[PDB]
Structure formats: C-alpha cells, structure tokens
C-alpha cells in the first residue's frame, strides 16, 4: 500500500519544504545562503523550540561571511509553520527534524560522559542510537532508538526513584525495549525485569546485562534517512511535489534526492572539506554506528573513522570568529543505496541474500552482493 504511507509522508515532507522556503523569504536570504546547512539548522531549531526564539544566521558579503544573531516571535514561527502545513500541526514534521538533528548528533559526538555516569560501559556506543532525541519525539521517533538508548533512561528514571502515573511509562518503556529484542530469552527476560514496582539494583544490574546481549544478539532498530530542511525546501521549490509523487525515509527516495542537492557548509581554516561532507552524509542516513566497510562501500569513497576525521562540529560556536572562516560544497552523493533496515540479524553472515542497489534501480528489482575481501580501513566509526 503505496498510497497512505508513501504519499502521507510526502505531505509531511512538503510541509518542511514550503516552511523552509517561507522562512528563508523572511530572513531575506539568498539562494546560496539558503543552501547553507548552517542557516538551515538554525531555522530548524527555532521551530522545534517554538513548538516545545532566535539563533545564529550567517550572511554573505563581498568576500567574507557575516554571522547575524537574530530573534523571532516564538509564535510568529508557530504561525508560519502551520501556514505551510495547512494549519495542521504535523507533529511528524517537527519530529522529522527532531531526528535529523538526532542522527547528526549521534555522528558528530560520542556520549561517553553520560553512559558511565549512568553505569553503562562506554564501549556501548553502537546501542545509543537516539540518546539525544527528546522524549517529545513521536511513536515512530522512538522506533529509531537503540537498545542501549532505552536502558540509559529507565536506569535514570529508576536510579533517582529507587534512590504516580510514572508507572505506565516504565512498563511501556520496557515493552518497546522488549520489542527491540528478536529472540525468545531476550524477549522473556525483559518481562522478568518489568515485574518489579520499585525495581532496584536487581533490575539495574540485569538490564545492563541485556544491554550487552544486544552487542551480540542485536535487536530491531529502524533507521530513518532524514535530510536537513534546506534539502527539502530546495526540492519543494524545484517543483517536486512529494505528496503527489510519493517519498520514503528508508527507500531510494532519500538517496535520490541527495543526488542533486546543492548543500553548502561553513568550514573552519584547518578543516578538511572531504571530511566535512563525510560527517553530514553519515547523519543523513543514521550510519554513525554502521560498519565503516559497508558505509564506504555504498558511499563510493573512503568513510574515515571518527578519530581520523578532521572536524569538530558542523555548528559554529559564538567563540569563533568569521574573519578566518570560509565555506565548502558538501559532497552528499553516494555510489549505491540500500534498504535502511530495522532488523539486527540472527543465526556470522546477516541479511542473507540482501544487497545494494544501483541508483538507477528505482524498483527493488536487482540486488548486488558486496564482497569485502579488500584493503579496508576499520569497522568501528568510534
């Protein structure tokens, strides 16, 4: 059923587009200045804040880049937003940029300070997918969460308590948790945890176990290809009418869109452009914990590890100066594409028979199997 699912999500994409365009028209930005992932970000956050303000806005004058610090009527923003979505709320839409931010953060940063202070092993990176993602996120917002993500929550919810309505949360938070697991025991053991009203160290210690079980017997976690507002704004402006032509977040749609995107980014004096593009690209598909081998395979070019990556973050801090600042064009194109999955595999070869698709292969017709016998460069982005 390609009617609701493909076209209803198109309608949520149209909203973000339309809105971004309107909002650019207010700031009186240029074309080059609307394609600046920097400005796009600021706008996206202005909105999520207002639906739950001001921000950094970079301008282009003869030669150099000027940063403007601006503020907007928190309600005006909310007004312009609905205008774009037909006076609807389109929580989906806000939630979408809620993820784009997530997926960018799960790749720009490593959240160790928090894992340990919770009592999780820092080496449990690959399980913290969406730890940044506000609880306000929707139902299809939590499905993107890693097993480890859930644990850090319950453990804190439990840790402060064990140190009214709060109960329905805990059980559900576990049901979700449990719905991540895809094996008998895994599934059953989650229940044995959900049994205690005041679950103390008994649970505290047990879930941590299950956290580690997922390192081997992974769960089902959905991945959503969520592109920056500018990319959708630009697309909408170019005529693409997604609600009518359909769109996906786990199909070929997102890759294809990024095959024509003209996104620019601010880049510090000593940073490596190629390295910058890599980052953004990995946030566009939630590939921050993917096997570097495969990421590079599909990417088309080396996908260098975080340590060897030359960049500190895409957003520009108030500390820095503009004099020594310039901007590059982000390389977001990829070689092939792949069905962003949810499954963690089980039996060691996973996704037996599943392959990669050419960017011409619109339909999921002919699959391609990668052979990794090769001089690779690692598997752990972190």
């Amino acid at each position: 059923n390609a009617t609701e699912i493909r076209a209803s999500v198109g309608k949520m994409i149209d909203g973000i587009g339309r809105f971004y365009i309107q909002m650019c028209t207010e700031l009186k930005l240029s074309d080059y200045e609307g394609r600046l992932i920097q400005n796009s970000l600021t706008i996206e956050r202005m909105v999520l804040s207002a639906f739950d303000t001001g921000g950094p806005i970079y301008r282009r004058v003869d030669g150099k880049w000027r940063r403007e610090l601006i503020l907007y009527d928190k309600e005006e923003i909310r007004r312009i937003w609905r205008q774009a979505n037909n006076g609807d709320d389109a929580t989906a839409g806000l939630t979408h940029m809620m993820i784009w931010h997530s997926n960018l953060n799960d790749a720009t940063y490593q959240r160790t300070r928090a894992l340990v202070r919770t009592g999780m092993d820092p080496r449990m990176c690959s399980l913290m997918q969406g730890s940044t993602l506000p609880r306000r996120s929707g139902a299809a917002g939590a499905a993107v969460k890693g097993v480890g993500t859930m644990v850090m929550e319950l453990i804190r919810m439990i840790k402060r308590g064990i140190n009214r309505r709060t109960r329905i949360a805990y059980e559900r938070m576990c049901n979700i948790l449990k719905g991540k697991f895809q094996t008998a025991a895994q599934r059953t053991m989650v229940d044995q945890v959900r049994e205690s009203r005041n679950p103390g160290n008994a649970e505290f210690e047990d879930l941590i176990f299950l956290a580690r079980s997922a390192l081997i017997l992974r769960g089902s976690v959905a991945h959503k290809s969520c592109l920056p507002a500018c990319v959708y704004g630009s697309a909408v402006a170019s005529g693409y009418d997604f609600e009518r032509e359909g769109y996906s977040l786990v199909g070929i749609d997102p890759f294809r869109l990024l095959q024509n995107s003209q996104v620019y980014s601010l880049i510090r004096p000593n940073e490596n452009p190629a390295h910058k593009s890599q980052l953004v690209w990995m946030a566009c598909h939630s590939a921050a914990f993917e096997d570097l081998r495969v990421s590079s395979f599909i990417r088309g070019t080396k996908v260098v590890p975080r340590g060897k990556l030359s960049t500190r973050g895409v957003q520009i801090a108030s500390n820095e100066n503009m004099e020594t600042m310039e901007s590059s064009t982000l390389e977001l194109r990829s070689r092939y594409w792949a069905i962003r999955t949810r499954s963690g595999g089980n039996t060691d070869v996973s996704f037996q028979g599943r392959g990669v698709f050419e960017l011409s292969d619109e339909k999921a017709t002919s699959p391609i199997v990668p052979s990794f016998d090769m001089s690779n460069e690692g598997s752990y982005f972190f």
């Binding site: 820092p122 080496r123 914990f289 081998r293 999955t341 996973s350 990794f372 598997s379 752990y380």
Partner: peptide, 19 residues
C-alpha cells in the same frame, strides 16, 4: 579502550556483523 565493540546495522546487505 573507550571505543566501539559492535556494529549497529543501518542497511540491508550480506554482511558479517562485527563484535
């Protein structure tokens, strides 16, 4: 250490999953 130990899979392909 302080590094990764397993790989979270993002795509559907024939891939030995590292841990």
């Amino acid at each position: 250490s302080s590094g990764q130990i397993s790989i979270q899979p993002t795509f559907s392909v024939q891939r030995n999953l590292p841990f």
